[PDB]
Design a protein around this nucleic acid. Structure first.
Lengths: 365, 346
DNA sequence: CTAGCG
DNA sequence: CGGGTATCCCACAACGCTAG
RNA sequence: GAGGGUGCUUGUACACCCAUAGGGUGAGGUUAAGAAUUACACUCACUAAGUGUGAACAACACAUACAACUUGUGGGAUAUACG
């Protein structure tokens, strides 16, 4: 049987549940410590995974031995004293024990070794650099971190202990969207995957990864929906005599160009702002647009994707084909403006995963 | 007390100085083999040097410092790879590791690794017979027994002048690089140029003029530099003015009877800080003009009146007005006297 | 509840 | 041409069990 | 008046607020000058924001309509700004 669930990530805001300020500050300092140690750990993992492969390659070219990475107790030619994943986990645990819980490591190391194997051939060949994990990386954690999850009616918020630190859930005015999903996890009706935890300027965010089941619709795959993507009209869709124009040039392209105009306005004007105090202070004004472009284009892409899938659903268009997308990709790679200003990879992945969630099969021509 | 010599890097195109195309093809494929060898060797030195330093953390394997790696790579690619290049590369990698050891310890930065398309390093010994050829109308040299001819084309940039001073020896060359991008051979050279003491030459004429869309624009020979732009100087003006208007509106609707000073101190402060803002802006612009004069050894600076009558003027506000503004001229004169620049009112 | 191992 | 950085494309992941 | 704060996260307007926030500072290093002092797109850091109760810059409670809500990690790539 195939996977009946698709992964999803929700942003639930969680707040430290301690009565006083100094205890909250202690928790927050401990979590900044967790983030910093996790980033150091991830660097350590990728370096430690790069090193022994070069040891293998050096030995191979020196004396032609087919050395391999495995437990020597199970392989004659192996160079490692235990399983490789245990090697990286053990070295990182030894270097950083007693500061952050070891499940951050036991869930980070898996993610890094899984990706290193798939980038192995390119690291041997040489078109990729060793990842340089950033300091704002969210530290991942597993289900061993959630315990005693319950609904406390005194506070009307979900309460749990994330590694011996309590947390109430600040769902706010979300009594229908995620309030149900966590209730589904208290009593065992939804599955929670190993999640990530963000820290952004005094607010904690629990990027919970669930497994949302598909939605069985009244779809007729014989009905075919034709969509055309352009930087003049974002989405144009056909279904027999039914057509919906999704988005406008003014709303998407012209807004994005105005936003870039503001960013360039500010970059030009930053030269004569408060100087003599470092680069960060001068470029505070352009820090303001840290992620404004990405967020606006992201929301517009999401709205277009949802409107298109709703178009298919209301017409029961069980199969969607994106017309002539190969030609558009080809011509776009030659013109800088479209590639920079026509986010087609994000729109493509959004449409693919939404259509695969909703049961609409997507074919690209 | 920084280093008296500055380092500049130029990207120049270099061709094989050979008559037949087949010879060029062989030379270029041999250079590609060189690049592959340098890539593998560099990865080996970085990883193995990391291993040797971090040995105590490598317990999970089965059961000077330069020389071991140098001999290993020498037996690795002897004959197929100029050992001078390998020695330069090993020196570079060990130096970089020494510089970044502290960051390597803490887990701050992972191990920097190289690529298939890295430009291979070479010392001064690789380049031989660096002479400027008139018959071939370019610069020619022999990189590891291989003659090579340089291409500048219709290059009006500083590359030709740098090449002339280099072949004349006025500029020292440092550890360079050779890159193979898009079927083209390029030379990434690093030049050690002594910072000649800049002295004010009174013959240099610097013309300072105001404009309608640049706060200060200054001309000096073929070097052109503008200081600021109208929106930059006007943003803060509009911002403070809007703040003053809004604060006035709020105060008029605020609680009265507590004193007129408590009501209009915000307005007085906004006007005063506007004046201080223009003072600081003139200060920075004057500093930039002085730096422009210094950077081109301009001993004489003259500010053009450029007033005229009617024409295009008398309608536009001519941002920065005219040289009658908030002690602008007196400040340029003071800073020039501090720098010894000749100032003649024009 | 946390830490180990593949 | 310097880091640093705003975005684009493009790939991958988001464990599972046992024992003190 | 742009821009922001609170109103779960993102977008649009929204009521209450902050706003010279492209500002006000603080720390370290470097540099120039006889000094005051200046300068650094050097590095780092801090400081404003709904209403009520509350001595409180403690805490708790209440706090918009609409659309969206699969996000993180990494690499490759170009561009803008400045030197």
């Amino acid at each position: 049987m195939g996977k009946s669930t698709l992964k999803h990530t929700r942003k639930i805001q969680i707040l430290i549940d301690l009565p006083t300020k100094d205890e909250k500050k202690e928790v927050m300092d401990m979590m900044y410590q967790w983030r910093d140690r996790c980033f150091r750990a991830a660097n350590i993992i990728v370096t430690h995974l790069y090193v022994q492969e070069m040891i293998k390659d050096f030995f191979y070219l020196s004396e032609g031995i087919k050395y391999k990475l495995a437990d020597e107790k199970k392989d004659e030619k192996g160079i490692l004293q235990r399983s490789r994943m245990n090697t990286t986990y053990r070295v990182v645990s030894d270097r950083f024990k007693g500061e952050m819980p070891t499940n951050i490591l036991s869930t980070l190391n898996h993610g890094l070794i899984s990706s290193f194997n798939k980038n192995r051939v390119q690291y041997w060949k040489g078109e990729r650099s060793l990842p340089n994990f950033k300091k704002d990386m969210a530290f991942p954690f597993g289900l061993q971190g959630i315990s005693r999850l319950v609904y406390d009616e005194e506070k009307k918020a979900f309460c749990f202990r994330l590694y011996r630190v309590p947390f109430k859930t600040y769902l706010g005015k979300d009594f229908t969207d995620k309030r149900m999903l966590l209730e589904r996890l208290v009593k065992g009706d939804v599955k929670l995957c190993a999640s990530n935890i963000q820290l952004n300027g005094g607010k904690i965010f629990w990027l919970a990864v669930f497994e949302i089941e598909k939605e069985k619709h009244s779809l007729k795959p014989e009905v075919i929906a034709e969509a055309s993507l352009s930087l003049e009209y974002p989405i144009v869709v056909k279904t027999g005599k039914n057509r919906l124009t999704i988005g406008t040039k003014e709303e998407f392209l012209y807004r994005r160009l105005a936003i870039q105009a503001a960013r360039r306005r500010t970059q030009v004007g930053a030269t004569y702002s408060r100087s003599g105090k470092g680069k960060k202070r001068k470029l505070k004004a352009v820090d303001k647009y840290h992620k404004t472009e990405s967020n606006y284009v992201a929301h517009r892409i999401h709205v277009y994707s949802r409107k298109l899938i709703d178009f298919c659903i209301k017409h029961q268009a069980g199969t969607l084909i994106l017309m002539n997308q190969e030609d558009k990709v080809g011509i776009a790679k030659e013109e800088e403006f479209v590639l920079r200003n026509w986010s087609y990879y994000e729109l493509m992945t959004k449409i693919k995963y939404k259509a695969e969630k909703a049961g609409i099969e997507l074919i690209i021509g």
